[PDB]
Design an enzyme around this catalytic site. Structure first.
Site, short mmCIF file in Angstrom:
data_model
loop_
_atom_site.label_atom_id
_atom_site.label_comp_id
_atom_site.label_asym_id
_atom_site.label_seq_id
_atom_site.Cartn_x
_atom_site.Cartn_y
_atom_site.Cartn_z
N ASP A 46 37.14 52.66 45.36
CA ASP A 46 36.13 52.38 46.37
C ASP A 46 36.42 53.05 47.71
O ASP A 46 35.61 53.82 48.23
CB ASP A 46 36.03 50.87 46.61
CG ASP A 46 35.43 50.13 45.45
OD1 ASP A 46 35.07 50.77 44.44
OD2 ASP A 46 35.31 48.89 45.55
N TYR A 179 24.06 40.68 50.09
CA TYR A 179 24.97 39.54 50.01
C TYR A 179 26.02 39.68 51.12
O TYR A 179 26.41 40.79 51.49
CB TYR A 179 25.64 39.50 48.64
CG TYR A 179 26.72 40.54 48.46
CD1 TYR A 179 28.05 40.24 48.75
CD2 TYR A 179 26.40 41.84 48.05
CE1 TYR A 179 29.04 41.22 48.63
CE2 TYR A 179 27.38 42.82 47.93
CZ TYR A 179 28.69 42.51 48.22
OH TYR A 179 29.66 43.47 48.10
N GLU A 218 26.61 40.76 44.81
CA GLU A 218 25.53 41.71 44.63
C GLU A 218 24.44 41.13 43.75
O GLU A 218 24.70 40.67 42.64
CB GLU A 218 26.08 42.99 44.02
CG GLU A 218 27.37 43.41 44.69
CD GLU A 218 28.10 44.50 43.95
OE1 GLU A 218 28.18 44.40 42.71
OE2 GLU A 218 28.60 45.44 44.61
N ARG A 234 25.43 38.34 40.92
CA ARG A 234 26.72 38.45 40.28
C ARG A 234 27.59 37.33 40.82
O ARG A 234 27.74 37.20 42.04
CB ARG A 234 27.33 39.81 40.63
CG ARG A 234 28.83 39.88 40.41
CD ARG A 234 29.41 41.19 40.91
NE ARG A 234 30.86 41.19 40.79
CZ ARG A 234 31.64 42.21 41.13
NH1 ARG A 234 31.10 43.32 41.60
NH2 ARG A 234 32.95 42.12 40.97
N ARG A 297 34.35 44.98 30.95
CA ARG A 297 33.07 45.61 31.25
C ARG A 297 32.66 46.60 30.18
O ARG A 297 32.84 47.81 30.33
CB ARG A 297 33.12 46.28 32.61
CG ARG A 297 33.20 45.31 33.75
CD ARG A 297 33.30 46.01 35.07
NE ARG A 297 33.24 45.10 36.20
CZ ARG A 297 33.16 45.50 37.47
NH1 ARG A 297 33.13 46.80 37.74
NH2 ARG A 297 33.11 44.62 38.46
N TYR A 327 28.28 48.78 36.26
CA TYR A 327 27.07 48.76 37.08
C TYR A 327 25.89 49.48 36.42
O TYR A 327 26.06 50.55 35.83
CB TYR A 327 27.38 49.38 38.44
CG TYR A 327 28.09 48.45 39.38
CD1 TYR A 327 29.08 47.58 38.93
CD2 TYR A 327 27.77 48.43 40.74
CE1 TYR A 327 29.74 46.72 39.81
CE2 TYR A 327 28.42 47.57 41.63
CZ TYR A 327 29.40 46.72 41.15
OH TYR A 327 30.04 45.85 42.02
N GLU A 348 26.79 52.88 34.49
CA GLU A 348 28.13 53.48 34.55
C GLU A 348 28.79 53.41 33.19
O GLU A 348 28.99 52.31 32.66
CB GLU A 348 29.01 52.74 35.57
CG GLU A 348 28.44 52.71 36.98
CD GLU A 348 29.38 52.11 38.01
OE1 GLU A 348 29.95 51.02 37.75
OE2 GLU A 348 29.54 52.71 39.09
C1 LIG Z 1 31.37 47.83 49.38
C2 LIG Z 1 32.19 47.69 48.12
O1 LIG Z 1 33.55 47.90 48.21
N1 LIG Z 1 31.59 47.38 46.98
C3 LIG Z 1 32.26 47.21 45.68
C4 LIG Z 1 31.96 45.86 45.00
C5 LIG Z 1 32.47 44.65 45.83
O2 LIG Z 1 33.89 44.72 45.98
C6 LIG Z 1 32.17 43.28 45.18
O3 LIG Z 1 30.76 43.12 45.01
C7 LIG Z 1 32.69 42.08 45.99
O4 LIG Z 1 32.78 42.31 47.38
O5 LIG Z 1 32.63 45.82 43.72
C8 LIG Z 1 32.65 46.86 42.94
C9 LIG Z 1 32.96 46.60 41.57
O6 LIG Z 1 33.03 47.59 40.72
O7 LIG Z 1 33.17 45.33 41.10
C10 LIG Z 1 32.39 48.27 43.38
C11 LIG Z 1 31.75 48.32 44.78
O8 LIG Z 1 32.03 49.61 45.35
#
Ligand SMILES: CC(=O)N[C@H]1[C@H]([C@H](O)[C@H](O)CO)OC(C(=O)O)=C[C@@H]1O
Length: 370
Positions: A46, A179, A218, A234, A297, A327, A348
């Site tokens: 990330d 969120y 999310e 989620r 996943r 995702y 993905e």
């Molecule tokens: C902004 C950010 O870092 N988003 C990340 C998101 C987030 O960590 C989670 O929704 C709780 O905050 O998680 C994931 C994930 O593959 O699970 C990838 C995203 O890039």
């Protein structure tokens, strides 16, 4: 054993000089073409996000296939010194303005860091285009106009990811699912909760709707037949969380877990939801994609809800893809080649080393309902 025979399965993004994650899919009904967005990170991690890429796919009716064009970077979609992530495209049917909402974060500052410190440094941005994404406007930082007062109240936040939603309300409003990690206890850790930014002036100004139950991340939204908005989020719990709104996104009620829709162990995974014209009592049905495996996943599955938004109505899934799946994002593409509802799916695959486009009809996924 075999995955679902679809209308089309094609790798649209692959790792190379960069890794590509966090897919978004937008359907332009009048263009009869799709807009596929994704994050172009310097690595899978990330903290290594940089810019957002885009690819236009135009649907060919003769062969019922979608031909995509070379990927390009939405250059304008970024703030100096910050890395862009989480694309949230929306199309304003009336103003013909195309919106791309994203989140800009300074340097490689992690999300964990804004969390442990309870210090939010995330900016809310959007970029617009009136020629279907050929040329975008200059980045516009919405943080203050959309947040401001609630900025200190959150340790961090994010939009989508995924396609947003324009309502068919008395004023065709913009609803951007999101969120936030809210600070509610001086000692306990911040708890994230889903909610939606609303705009009734076609983007002129915004407003944050009320949160839903806490411990939701999310999410995405849809609208259904008197006219409600079901949200699907989620959760770090056994399964997915889902609530409905009867005031155009401002309030989400009856929020509850839905065990039929599993979630991987740690903190679950993003998933997508859309509505579409019922093939026959209810005006719309819902379709939702998410991984069906429960320890990891994998095995992307599609779920149907023929009597929305009754939670028990949700159906059992159908394998859209075997193996590593994460995702995903969905889009209603109208009527397919076989007279049934056409769906476009972006997900993905292969351990985040490629993002795949999937196209199929309702008659294919749930032929039983015939
Ligand atoms: C902004 C950010 O870092 N988003 C990340 C998101 C987030 O960590 C989670 O929704 C709780 O905050 O998680 C994931 C994930 O593959 O699970 C990838 C995203 O890039």
């Amino acid at each position: 054993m075999a995955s679902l025979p679809v209308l089309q399965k094609e790798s649209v993004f692959q790792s190379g000089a960069h890794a590509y994650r966090i897919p978004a899919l937008l359907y332009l009904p009048g263009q009869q073409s799709l807009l596929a967005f994704a994050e172009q990170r310097a690595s899978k991690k990330d903290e290594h996000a940089e810019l957002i890429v885009l690819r236009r796919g135009d649907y060919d009716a003769p062969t019922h296939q979608v031909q995509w064009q070379a990927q390009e970077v939405v250059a304008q979609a970024r703030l100096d010194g910050h890395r862009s992530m989480n694309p949230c495209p929306l199309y304003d049917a009336q103003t013909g303005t195309l919106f791309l909402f994203f989140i800009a974060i300074p340097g490689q500052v992690t999300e964990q860091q804004q969390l442990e410190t309870r210090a939010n440094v995330t900016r809310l941005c959007q970029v617009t285009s009136t020629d279907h994404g050929r040329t975008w406007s200059s980045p516009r930082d919405l943080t203050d106009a959309a947040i401001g007062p609630a900025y200190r109240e959150w340790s961090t936040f994010a939009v989508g990811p995924g396609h947003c939603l324009q309502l068919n309300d008395r004023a065709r409003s913009l609803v951007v699912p999101a969120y936030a990690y809210r600070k509610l206890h001086p000692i306990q850790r911040p708890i994230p909760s889903a909610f939606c930014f609303l705009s009734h002036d076609h983007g002129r100004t915004w407003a944050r709707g009320h949160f839903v139950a806490q411990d939701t991340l999310e999410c995405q939204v849809a609208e259904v037949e008197q006219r409600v908005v079901t949200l699907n989020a989620r959760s770090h719990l056994r399964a997915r969380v889902q609530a409905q709104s009867t005031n155009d996104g401002l309030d989400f009620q009856e929020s509850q877990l839905v065990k039929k829709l599993v979630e991987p162990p740690p903190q679950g995974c993003q998933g997508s939801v859309i509505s579409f014209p019922s093939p026959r009592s209810p005006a719309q049905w819902l379709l939702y994609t998410h991984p069906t495996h429960s320890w990891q996943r994998a095995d992307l599955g599609a779920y149907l809800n023929p009597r929305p938004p009754a939670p028990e109505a949700w159906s059992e899934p159908v394998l859209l893809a075997k193996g590593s799946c994460a995702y995903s994002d969905l889009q209603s593409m109208g009527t397919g080649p076989d007279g049934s509802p056409l769906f476009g799916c972006l997900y993905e695959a292969n351990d985040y080393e490629e993002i795949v486009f999937l196209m199929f009809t309702l008659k294919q996924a749930f032929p039983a309902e015939y």
